[model samples]
Target: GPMGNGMNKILPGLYIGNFKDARDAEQLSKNKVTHILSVHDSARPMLEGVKYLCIPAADSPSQNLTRHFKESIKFIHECRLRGESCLVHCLAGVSRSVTLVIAYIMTVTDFGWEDALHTVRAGRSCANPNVGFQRQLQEFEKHEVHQYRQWLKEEY
Candidate 1:
């Protein structure tokens, strides 16, 4: 219930929220956010003097966002590494963008699908991606199975 307006930080350098949160340049600046990932919309404006990426798709289970997963994660990672933050948003910031952030977390962290979802939900309780997105995230976890095994093989 903390993210009353959806502009909440899920990680040290990562945020997720709706379009209103995205357009608030003042708040974005206050947070030192350097990147914005505006998904599922075309009419959204870019943040001034900030790195921005937009992914347009109808908010439905049939829409596939996995294609943008790697680049989005990279964008966020770059910003974080540069001592900045990234705000990821869709129309509601509860579905599409949330899904992407989950995938990003799964890729960057050693988290699985459920762990990723749990991580996002811990910040914004309203975050519930479509079932299709959930399945794709699960598939992503399946794909990472080899890498996890490799980590165990090597980290040990």
Candidate 2:
């Protein structure tokens, strides 16, 4: 199955993978990936020519995952804005990575949460399927929408 956003290019402008073995990471480097965003903090091979950023997963309760999600979104957006394509991945490219991607979609596009998720899934098959992550995203959406509305009221 295509991993969302069509399989025209394995690592097109941006690619998302669950796990990157040494060989695959090497191949991605050869393909000019430029940037790799790993959501896990474990030690991973550093491709000679590629830059990697490791942002550890923010556990719940003690630390708010929403803040981590927002930070990740900002990082990815900055990379894209700087004319670099980024591949964001977690252990399975399913939960954390998907959540950050969903957050990015919500931030960059005008679409609502439902539409954003649909669009992301249409592009990446291994997106957020975990119920817990889904619920967290819903809460994030609610909080973000309320904040935006409040900002708008204050501005206008």
The number of the candidate with the highest TM-score is 1
Please report, in order, the local distance difference test score of every candidate based on alpha carbons.
Answer: 0.80, 0.59
TM-score for candidate 2: 0.71
| RMSD to the hidden true structure, all candidates | 3.9, 5.2
Clashing pairs in 1: none
Q: Which ten residues in a row have the lowest lDDT in candidate 2?
A: 2-11
In candidate 2, residue 95 scores what lDDT? 63
TM-scores across all candidates?
A: 0.86, 0.71
Q: Which digits, one per residue and each the tens of the lDDT, describe model 2 over residues 102-149?
A: 766666656566676777666676566356666767887777855643
Clashing pairs in 2: 4-123, 4-124, 5-123
Candidate 2 global CA lDDT score = 0.59
